[PDB]
């Protein structure tokens, strides 16, 4: 309900640096920026208990719920299939390596919910999963849920050329690692370009994002950024909406190559469905 209003900006009537770019495309990480403190209070770390390592990115939609990629939990081709005892979710972080003493909170998972029809055998269609936290988290200036779009929010922001923003602790290069969360603002590309760019069968639970080889700007998510959110700020009620989930790509910031993201809106119903059956 308080979704998408960052306590250290919107709340205080402060604007972070690249917000303008976002908002000026509505017509008013590889090669990304260092995030500002409290700029993405809904960003989660998906952390492995042993080895103690970061597996993916994620979002905080509720005080009890996290949104990630299905592929984070379960990928048979790679012998990946995690259970809610092999993980710890870290909320309120900035630096990637250190245990930020009194700023971050670490939770245990209560149940994992993969999309019944996630298609790990062909194209990662429906790459979405929900985790429900053992106990609710308290919001602080650094921990705060993002909003989930509605048919008319998804309607009007989700368009070719609109900038959205990606965030992650992942690879800074294909063949680099940050000390601090990174950010990158990328434009939504039309379907046709998305299609003609790869051999994989593009579905509607998908959208692609990146610049063309020709706009003189690069940027992409990369290794370790999975599950993290692709967000947009409605110029209407200026709240942040989670529009996509980092799904798949071909390389990292490869010319004439774009990012594919789960269409959060398209699967919103399944997400309702699971929150009020067992949440």
């Amino acid at each position: 309900a308080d979704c998408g209003l960052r306590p250290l900006f919107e709340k205080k009537s402060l604007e972070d640096k690249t917000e303008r770019e976002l908002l000026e495309s509505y017509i008013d990480i590889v090669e990304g920026s260092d995030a500002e403190i409290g700029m993405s209070p809904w960003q989660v770390m998906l952390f492995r208990k042993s080895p103690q390592e970061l597996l993916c990115g994620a979002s905080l939609i509720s005080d009890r719920w996290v949104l990630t990629a299905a592929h984070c939990l379960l990928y048979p081709p790679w012998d990946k299939n995690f259970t809610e005892n092999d993980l710890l979710v870290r909320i309120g972080k900035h630096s990637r390596t250190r245990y930020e003493r009194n700023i971050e909170k670490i939770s245990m998972l209560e149940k994992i919910y993969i999309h019944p029809r996630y298609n790990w055998r062909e194209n990662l269609d429906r790459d979405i999963a929900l985790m429900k936290l053992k106990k609710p988290v308290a919001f602080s200036d650094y921990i705060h849920p993002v909003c989930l779009p509605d048919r008319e929010t998804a309607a009007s922001l989700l368009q070719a050329g609109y900038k959205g923003r990606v965030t992650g602790w992942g690879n800074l290069k294909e063949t680099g690692q940050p000390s601090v969360l990174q950010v990158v603002n990328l434009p939504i590309v039309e379907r046709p370009v998305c299609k003609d760019s790869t051999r994989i069968r593009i579905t509607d639970n998908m959208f692609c994002a990146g610049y063309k080889p020709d706009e003189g700007k690069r940027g992409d998510a990369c290794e370790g950024d999975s599950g993290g959110p692709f967000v947009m700020k409605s110029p209407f009620n200026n709240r942040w909406y989670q529009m996509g989930i980092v799904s798949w790509g071909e390389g990292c910031d490869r010319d004439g190559k774009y990012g594919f993201y789960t269409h959060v809106f398209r699967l919103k119903k399944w997400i309702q469905k699971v929150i009020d059956q067992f949440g």
Binding site: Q52, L54, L88, T97, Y99, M108
Partner: peptide
Amino acid sequence: DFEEIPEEYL
């Protein structure tokens, strides 16, 4: 590379 976490968390 990771600082250890509250051993109380595993």
